[PDB]
Design a protein around this ligand. Structure first.
Ligand SMILES: CCCCCOC(=O)c1cccc(C(=O)c2cc(O)c(O)c([N+](=O)[O-])c2)c1
Ligand SMILES: CCCCCOC(=O)c1cccc(C(=O)c2cc(O)c(O)c([N+](=O)[O-])c2)c1
Ligand SMILES: CCCCCOC(=O)c1cccc(C(=O)c2cc(O)c(O)c([N+](=O)[O-])c2)c1
Ligand SMILES: CCCCCOC(=O)c1cccc(C(=O)c2cc(O)c(O)c([N+](=O)[O-])c2)c1
Ligand SMILES: [Ca+2]
Ligand SMILES: [Ca+2]
Ligand SMILES: [Ca+2]
Ligand SMILES: [Ca+2]
Lengths: 121, 121, 121, 121
């Protein structure tokens, strides 16, 4: 299992110790509060009122938690995933990232606390 | 495992199939959007700007997911719990509930989708 | 989880740390060599050539590993059980016992090494 | 998870669907009765009285269950392995094999039933 913090202001994303292999079943739980700029804060699902303009992951809101697995594209995590199996041919190390627009992470604040474990399979 | 929806207007809470027994290790993942009355919606950690004026759970925000286990008081769930063990003396059936003030559930809207499983021990 | 030795001369059996509750899924692995009398020894499936003339568990061989769950009657374990769920209405502490005839444990020798864990459910 | 039978007379061993990847934790439970020649039978620990006269695995008895992970050397399985982790550099498909002397498989009989799964990590 891996536990750690994902800073909203970390454009590169936080690499985890988890290597996703074919067939693997994993669980992720994400909590806390962060911002893409405003004094207001949002949870891991982000700000459902913010537009999608140039976000790294078009499938989640601004300020959501997303991930990449190896060199996949971005995949939504949000609050987390229960006993989840990736699509065919997705494999590698799990990096977690705050969903925002490239070049705009400087004004971000806060962090999410995230756990990831491999489940029985 | 149990998977189901928790309606925000359900004052009694959603009973699950899960019986928490001494020594159990559990994982919960909650997702979605709901409202304790306003047109806006919030995720499982609720509205961090809303005052607590009589919530069923004073350790979580208005609109957050909470639970009771058997005869326990409310216990925060929020986005979820990763490989969690219950407080001393806590055991029994898990009921999931939207955190709002007694008697004001009629104007709530939405639902959270929740998964619960028992982990290896 | 629980790891321990079960002596073949132990008539009362070895009580583990595991309490079996409804819905639980367990795995058992048993290894080693023991005897009900002879200078020879057998593994956890026992002696497939020996008669049953009053074994505590009529569904396994003399010299096999068996168990009780709470006040159940005996259940075969043998080499082990993989992600097993018990019959209805069985609950309580797991007691591991060597399968022999009541009153004859005194000439027994050796032990099995046993791992028990609860699995994800 | 994977379940299947491993014949005593199969010199090549039985390929499973389990790919052991670095950091995997696995459980294996084996049961049953087989023979490397004699009319009598033995369990997955094999025959503790028979000499090693060129077994494919010199760390288990003749008639024991062993395995390869990819093109590893032989690894003892016996009755099973509880929440086990492989040696460094060991990875690939798990192949289960009856431990006998090469070219003597033709007088073998019986089989073992084996479950393998990956465990929480
Ligand atoms: C795809 C990379 C090129 C984008 C350049 O344009 C932007 O930076 C751009 C364009 C439209 C909306 C936004 C936006 O939603 C946005 C998001 C932010 O977190 C933020 O801090 C700022 N900001 O600092 O101005 C803008 C940003
Ligand atoms: C029948 C209910 C008893 C009323 C007690 O509630 C209050 O007086 C009171 C005062 C300030 C804020 C709140 C509150 O946070 C609150 C929370 C709500 O979800 C809600 O639907 C209502 N509401 O519609 O009246 C008020 C409630
Ligand atoms: C030995 C004290 C009295 C128990 C009574 O045992 C029997 O009546 C009975 C009758 C038939 C077979 C067996 C038997 O399978 C049996 C099994 C043993 O492990 C053992 O050590 C002995 N023993 O030492 O005599 C007998 C026992
Ligand atoms: O090869 C040999 O030279 C040799 C010498 C001594 C014993 C063994 C031996 O352990 C052995 C093992 C067998 O399973 C088996 O089927 C036979 N067999 O029938 O030839 C011999 C083999
Ligand atoms: Ca920003
Ligand atoms: Ca309300
Ligand atoms: Ca005896
Ligand atoms: Ca042979």
């Amino acid at each position: 299992a891996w536990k750690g913090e994902v800073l909203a202001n970390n454009e590169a994303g936080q690499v985890t110790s988890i290597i996703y292999n074919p067939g693997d079943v994993i669980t992720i739980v994400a909590a806390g509060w962060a911002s893409y700029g405003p004094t207001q804060k949002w949870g891991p699902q982000g700000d459902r009122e913010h537009p999608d303009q140039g976000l790294i992951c078009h499938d989640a809101f601004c300020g959501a938690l997303v991930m990449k697995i190896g060199n996949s594209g971005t995949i939504p995590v949000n609050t987390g995933l229960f006993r989840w199996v990736a699509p065919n041919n997705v494999q590698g190390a799990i990096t977690l990232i705050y969903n925002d627009v490239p070049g705009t992470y400087g004004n971000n604040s806060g962090s999410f606390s995230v756990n990831i474990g491999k489940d029985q399979s």
